[PDB]
Design a protein around this ligand. Structure first.
Ligand SMILES: Cn1ncnc2c(=O)n(C)c(=O)nc1-2
Ligand SMILES: [Mn+2]
Length: 219
């Protein structure tokens, strides 16, 4: 799983307010020119973006198998649900998962994903305290093949011969997938096309990786 994720934002103030209101003060901590949010076992640190840039990403958050309708209702309280092909949710047969989406103040595409067999059934009400972990993050890179290769050299599940340098590649299994692909591809549920922005990531198993501002995945 993702222990720590570092992202950039050109809307630090609005983002801090947005997440404080969504998650509650007990999951959101203001720092110096940054703030953190805790999503179950995953933390995201949002740092101030460079001037002249407007970084955004696609982040999916795992929720329990039985929590989708409550999750969707909850998410809708924080912004208009995004739609694709006139639908305000998706079923993804490959993940056997239900998803819903909202845009945050930076234009991040924030998804709740409820994996129907790859997430637990929690017999309790859903709430902001029931977000389990980060289930997806985009790895938008200037070199998909290089990125896929290094991710394998990092001991992640990768089938190199299946990698599509011009398309989106699902890297992972169980409840975490890295969405590896090139810039230019429009994100489902969004008007925004994928753009390379820097980030850093620490997995629970100690592996550390980063995407530079020009799109190079490094370990
Ligand atoms: C292909 N695909 N499968 C599953 N989920 C997505 C998704 O959330 N987004 C945002 C996307 O652009 N493409 C997807
Ligand atoms: Mn997604």
């Amino acid at each position: 799983s993702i222990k720590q994720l570092t992202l950039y934002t050109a809307e630090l103030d609005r983002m801090l307010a947005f997440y404080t209101n969504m998650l509650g003060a007990q999951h959101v901590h203001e720092q110096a020119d940054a703030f953190t949010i805790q999503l179950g076992v995953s933390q995201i640190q949002f740092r101030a973006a460079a001037d002249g840039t407007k970084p955004f990403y696609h982040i999916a958050i795992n929720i329990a198998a039985n929590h989708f309708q409550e999750g969707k209702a909850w998410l809708s309280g924080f912004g208009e649900l995004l739609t694709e092909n006139d639908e305000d949710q998706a079923y993804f047969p490959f993940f056997n998962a239900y998803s819903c989406y909202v845009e945050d103040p930076s234009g991040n595409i924030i998804e709740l994903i409820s994996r129907q067999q790859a997430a637990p059934v929690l017999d309790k009400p859903f709430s902001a305290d029931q977000l389990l972990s980060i289930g997806e993050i985009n790895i938008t890179t200037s070199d998909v093949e290089q990125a896929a290769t290094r991710l394998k050299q990092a001991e992640l599940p990768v089938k190199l011969d299946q990698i599509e340098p011009a398309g989106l590649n699902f890297i992972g299994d169980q409840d975490l997938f890295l969405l590896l692909g090139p810039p230019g591809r429009r994100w489902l549920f969004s008007e925004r096309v994928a753009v390379i922005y820097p980030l850093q990531m620490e997995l629970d198993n100690g592996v550390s990786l980063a995407i530079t501002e020009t799109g190079e995945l490094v370990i």
